[PDB]
Amino acid sequence: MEMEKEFEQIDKSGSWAAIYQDIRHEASDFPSRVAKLPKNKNRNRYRDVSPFDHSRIKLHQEDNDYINASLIKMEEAQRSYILTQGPLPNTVGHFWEMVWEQKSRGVVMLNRVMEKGSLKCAQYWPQKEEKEMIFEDTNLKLTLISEDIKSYYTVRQLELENLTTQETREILHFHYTTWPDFGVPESPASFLNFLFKVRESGSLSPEHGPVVVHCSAGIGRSGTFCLADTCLLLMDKRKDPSSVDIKKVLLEMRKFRMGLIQTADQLRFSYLAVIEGAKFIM
Numbered sequence: 099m100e101m102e103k104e105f106e107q108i109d110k111s112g113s114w115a116a117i118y119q120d121i122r123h124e125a126s127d128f129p130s131r132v133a134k135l136p137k138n139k140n141r142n143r144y145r146d147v148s149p150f151d152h153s154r155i156k157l158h159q160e161d162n163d164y165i166n167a168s169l170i171k172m173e174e175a176q177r178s179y180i181l182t183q184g185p186l187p188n189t190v191g192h193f194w195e196m197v198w199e200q201k202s203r204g205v206v207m208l209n210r211v212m213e214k215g216s217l218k219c220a221q222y223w224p225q226k227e228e229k230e231m232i233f234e235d236t237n238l239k240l241t242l243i244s245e246d247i248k249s250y251y252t253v254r255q256l257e258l259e260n261l262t263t264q265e266t267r268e269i270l271h272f273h274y275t276t277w278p279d280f281g282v283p284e285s286p287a288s289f290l291n292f293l294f295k296v297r298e299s300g301s302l303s304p305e306h307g308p309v310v311v312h313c314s315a316g317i318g319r320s321g322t323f324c325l326a327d328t329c330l331l332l333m334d335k336r337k338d339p340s341s342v343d344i345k346k347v348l349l350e351m352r353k354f355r356m357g358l359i360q361t362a363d364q365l366r367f368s369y370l371a372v373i374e375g376a377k378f379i380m
């Protein structure tokens with residue numbers, strides 16, 4: 099079926115939970131043996147969220163190459179994304195090592211450091227120009243260059259230096275700051291505006307490594323971001339945009355990382371975002 103009318107048909111029939119459970123039943127199951135080794139217990143935020151072995155990002159280190167991060171490679175859309183968990187106190191150095199080694203231009207953050215009165219990820223970037231951060235385990239230095247605070251999101255320019263080679267790079271930090279503590283946003287308008295700002299920066303383009311995107315677990319909000327981007331790109335590329343099937347795209351992405359889209363409310367919100375976004379594109 100088309101999307102917008104499939105949408106009204108699920109709303110009128112109140113079957114979002116049943117649609118979402120079908121997706122969960124059909125989703126791929128692949129091994130995640132490296133993630134479950136005992137030496138990696140403090141590298142995982144949640145015991146039930148792990149990268150598959152076949153698509154995990156490897157650090158270029160011979161001691162321990164493990165990080166909770168996956169490469170999502172979308173062949174028809176010609177887009178790649180790295181989805182990862184919010185960094186932990188003992189993985190902030192690994193996180194920036196990955197950004198460096200994978201040649202990423204942008205980092206997309208979809209959570210606040212504290213939500214619901216608890217810490218959802220480490221404070222992994224510097225907050226003042228004159229107070230830079232040094233990650234001694236991976237030999238990197240990170241400096242805040244500039245910051246632009248808007249009503250729904252903040253963009254920061256960062257300088258990452260490889261202290262071993264003295265090479266430097268500019269990284270863009272796109273921080274969506276207004277996703278609610280409970281539920282999903284009422285309108286997709288600010289989320290779509292944010293996605294277009296990431297796109298306009300070049301961070302999603304083939305002349306760079308894959309964008310790094312995260313929330314707390316790296317599957318819920320993060321899944322919504324890449325599902326909406328990929329669906330809109332396919333609607334631009336194909337002769338028949340109404341052939342784009344959001345459930346099929348989601349199942350394809352779940353071949354590369356488990357659990358993408360965590361609730362039926364996130365699924366409905368993803369439909370809403372693609373539907374509204376397709377009107378603005380033209």
Ligand SMILES: N#Cc1ccc(Cn2cccn2)cc1
Nearest residue numbers: 201202203266267268269307
């Ligand atoms: N000055 C400067 C500078 C250098 C590099 C980058 C990003 N990049 C990753 C791999 C090659 N380039 C961004 C700014």
